[PDB]
């Protein structure tokens, strides 16, 4: 990373000397090959976006592998961790869920539907009848007052998932549901406890 760097504290005759350029450029090569890459990695570490890969997964796994997303988009990894770190102030809401969706699903509309139950425990004991908010308009009226709990499910539009999965022919609903729920478990589930309760996943 230095060109003719030994051209300044050297008399010009000894600069044009035969062996002095040999020693100079050999040591320049040696430093280039075995000191500078440390300087490059530290300069990368200076910037959140510049960090080399080794540093990126180092900072990733210092906390643990359960706090990250297993993505191949290495360029977005600095951006993804930036979001994962600046969300800590707003991560009691659906925003971190959407932040996960950024990479796990590339912007899929996900709605948090809390669990609704009838008041009438004798007619419908609590936890037996769980009505989604989508049908709450037309279904929960017949059950009187409509218990709302922090427990709830998550609904994904079937049209949206079909659009994002990039398959026009046969769609394995069970397989895609299993895949997405596993992604939910391994990237989003730790954000749920304690208050947030997930009791099932559904597609509109």
């Amino acid at each position: 990373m230095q060109r003719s760097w030994f051209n300044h504290r050297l008399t010009s005759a000894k600069q044009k000397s035969l062996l002095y350029k040999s020693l100079a450029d050999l040591v320049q090569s040696m430093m280039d090959t075995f000191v500078d890459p440390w300087l490059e990695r530290i300069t990368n570490r200076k910037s959140i976006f510049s960090m080399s890969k080794e540093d990126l997964e180092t900072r990733t796994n210092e906390l643990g592998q359960f706090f990250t997303i297993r993505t191949s988009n290495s360029s977005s990894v600095p951006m993804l961790l930036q979001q994962r770190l600046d969300e800590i102030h707003f991560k009691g809401t659906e925003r971190p869920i959407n932040q996960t969706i950024y990479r796990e699903f590339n912007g899929i509309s996900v709605l948090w539907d809390p669990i609704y139950a009838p008041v009438d425990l004798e007619r419908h004991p609590y936890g037996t009848v769980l009505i989604p908010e989508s049908t709450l308009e037309t279904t929960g009226g017949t059950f009187g007052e409509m218990f709302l709990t922090s427990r709830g499910m998550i609904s994904i539009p079937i049209n949206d998932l079909a659009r994002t999965m990039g398959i026009t022919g046969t769609i394995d609903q069970s397989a895609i549901t299993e895949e997405i729920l596993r992604k939910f478990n391994q990237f989003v589930k730790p954000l749920l406890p304690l208050h947030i309760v997930f009791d099932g996943l559904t597609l509109y």
Binding site: S12, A13, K14, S17, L19
Partner: protein, 176 residues
Amino acid sequence: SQYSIQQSLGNASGVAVSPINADATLSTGVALNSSLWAGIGVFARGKPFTVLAVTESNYEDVLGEPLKPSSGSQFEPIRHVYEAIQQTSGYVVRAVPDDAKFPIIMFDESGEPAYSALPYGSEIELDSGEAFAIYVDDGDPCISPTRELTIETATADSAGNERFLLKLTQTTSLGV
């Protein structure tokens, strides 16, 4: 600037130093004009059958470097001059057998070169061809070092006469 060092001097002004080579010699001194010696010897360089007022300044230069003592019986004169010049100067005379020959380069009308060698003392003549020629006379066989010449044009005279600059140099084995 003061940081630059040259090798040869033309129009640019600078301070030069000795290059990085394998061998070098020196000879410096002032004439005596007090009491002198004379003697015949065989050495390097110098015109054969010629007297040479040798001093501490030219002892190593125009007489060439000392030869190998096992290289013939010619080491006695070089040792004698080495031991004597350190304190006194002389008028040493040098000659060589006829076997020695000096080289010459001829430039024809077009300026084409032709190389030749003639025994020392022989006089070269120019016939209808062979427009002109230049022969070396210092006695060096042009083998260690070698004599090279570079010729090109230059500015004209005040009378407008076309002029050309030529430079002579000695090149060692290592390339200095």
